């Protein structure tokens, strides 16, 4: 599969496999985890997306069971992980309330646990998982810079940051943030006009798109009819067209697909087969927003 360079130091697969449901599968054995990773690799999807909090702080260890039992498998993938969200589950069950923690001490503890749980000495990309209204940017930026200098983390980014959050944390760091993982799909189009995507495009930062299929709501009329029509014109399913709509954007959006289904992994690359011309991009955008683009103001 085509590669995307987020920076001179980090290259992903153009589509990323989200592992947030890996702990929900009835099968969490090393063998089934390896099978899922091997199905991705068969399609050239090498990038796995994790977070400390997934599975109530167990999804990384479940991935680790796979990796620790298959020597050589970690060298074939990039691992994205995240920290900053503290819910009273698993190892954080002492917690009195759901909160964010962007402190140097917490980031280091979470990274040490990610490395322990997945059986590796480095993660390819670490994201601050949510913007913290209590962030000390100086402290957080120093911790993130030291994690890169150490080699434990190849690159750093953020998730769900607004442009002003991104700007504040980048002002406190020597290393450049290489991504912002944000909701983007035909059902979530605000970032295209509200400044979120423009900011990233001006900074030459690729976003990672979460819920790129619209979070299950798109498949459950006019939008779906057009996705199915284009798919049938190009020999792919409506799912591939909804991902290709993201891939078409010149901001170089990196979709994160989160299925436990080996047959949807088998077809995930079909999005790269879609030719999405400018007019088709607008047809889908207009059906999704439910109204025509603004025409001449003088009318």
């Amino acid at each position: 599969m085509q590669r995307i360079a987020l920076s001179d130091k980090l290259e992903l697969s153009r589509i990323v496999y989200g592992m947030w449901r890996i702990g929900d599968d009835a099968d969490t054995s090393p063998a089934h985890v390896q099978a899922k990773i091997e199905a991705c690799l068969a399609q050239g999807i090498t990038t796995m997306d994790q977070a400390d909090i997934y599975g109530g702080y167990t999804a990384e260890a479940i991935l680790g069971g796979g990796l620790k039992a298959a020597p050589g498998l970690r060298d074939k993938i990039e691992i994205v992980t995240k920290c900053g969200i503290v819910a009273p589950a698993g190892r954080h069950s002492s917690a009195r309330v759901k909160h964010y923690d962007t402190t140097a001490g917490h980031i280091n503890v979470s990274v040490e646990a990610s490395l322990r749980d997945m059986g590796t000495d480095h993660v390819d990309l670490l994201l601050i998982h949510r913007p913290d209204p209590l962030i000390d940017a100086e402290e957080t930026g120093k911790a993130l810079d030291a994690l890169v200098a150490s080699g434990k983390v190849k690159a750093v980014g953020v998730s769900n940051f607004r442009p002003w959050d991104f700007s504040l944390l980048q002002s406190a760091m020597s290393n450049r943030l290489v991504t912002n993982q944000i909701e983007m799909s035909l059902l979530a189009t605000d970032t295209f006009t509200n400044g979120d995507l423009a900011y990233l495009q001006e900074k030459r930062v690729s976003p990672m798109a979460w819920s790129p299929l619209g979070g299950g709501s798109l498949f459950s009329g006019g939008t779906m009819a057009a996705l199915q029509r284009i798919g049938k014109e190009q020999g792919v399913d409506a799912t591939a067209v909804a991902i290709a709509w993201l891939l078409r954007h010149p901001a170089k959006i990196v979709p994160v697909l989160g299925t436990n289904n080996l047959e949807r992994i088998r077809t995930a690359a079909d999005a790269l087969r879609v030719t999405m011309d400018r007019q088709t991009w607008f047809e889908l955008y207009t059906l999704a927003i439910g109204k025509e683009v603004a025409l001449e103001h003088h009318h």
Copy 2:
């Protein structure tokens, strides 16, 4: 009429004549087009505002009929035109959907058609007509820079851009964008407090105000009574006061007036006769917003 320098390379009349309705007139003859331009020139209004899309891609050619039959008339005016909006009309009737196109190829084709249609070798100002959610800023900025270097376009700006759109496109260009054509009037006051006008004021960019009379809704109670009162105090009509309210702002707003009526052209300059002191500016602003300005927070 008083001149306004948008830059060292482009100077307009302080009021601009919008030609978006020129094709709606029952009379589209060269003679009637010349009459309208000559009525503007009689009031010192030298700047004409066009767009490729006006008249379903025919308004420029209708202006051209006037200019081509009156040698010397083009040298007396500045021409603003715009591109980026593609509706299925006239030469774009093959189009499947209403969309934006900011590609180098489309901008060049639209500019070549503007020059052909108006019978000139240059336009004074070219605007991207709407912010394109699919913009490639690098590509668009290269096309706009080459159009300036070529002499085909004296200066470039945008229309309906948010500050983040303006910032993204300017980051990709060597030439400075000299304006943003946005809605501003007593019925459209959001830009005064929402950051749109502050951004332009910090960049020392004059906006062009579209629908400066409120788009026909202002004339169709308290606001109109005050405009009529001030006009009767200063020997002008309520229309001149509504334009002078824009002219008073220190951001150096350039109103675009869009009438086919020779008698409203004859009086358009009366706005420059209005003395609009700070208190009068606030009286009108407060009547328009329908509530007092925020006073001391401690109360």
Copy 3:
């Protein structure tokens, strides 16, 4: 009381005494004004917050009655004052409408009146009281710079500015704006996520928080029960906990407390006795917003 350096030139008390109600007290005698200032000084609160408009342009003169009758008292305090709001009261009663005035002439007249009314040759901090939709930033910034160079004003800031207002005025000034006085409390939490506080945090500018108790609405269920519980755990009242919630933020927020009650002045410093850990900060923030913080987007 702990000091806060807004800059190399200006240091306040970490809590500020707002004098906006000083004219509402039945007692406005010099003796009662001195008593209030002496109650603050007894708690290490040295910073007094004024504005030209307070008391309909009489509150400064009422403070002055106190200061002029107590030689040496002005040297013990810092004075913050503000201008820019013109209401038809007192010396501005000729005014036809409520408006803003950020002109050099008005700022100078207001500062000269603040110095005359309080009987001093300098103010520690001058704020533009409200963002003016008619601001000429070049003119206002020149007036503010000259006021600092003159020694009449030790430092300048703003009040109720949005980030774009702050950015515009700072672009026109040589001196750095040292604060933005904005609404911040458990009932006013928008600035924590909407970019207002992030902007100030990136610029290393401390905000001053007005209505830090929520403007009387907080004391008049779940939020109050938690403030009372934490206070009873730490030997202080719920008021001290609501102020400590602001003091905990790493942006170094400076609360402005506006009581005429000598017994609430006597206890105002109790906020500095509160230990507010990250989880407690989130518990209060969550009770105030009325919903959990956003958890993992993948769920």
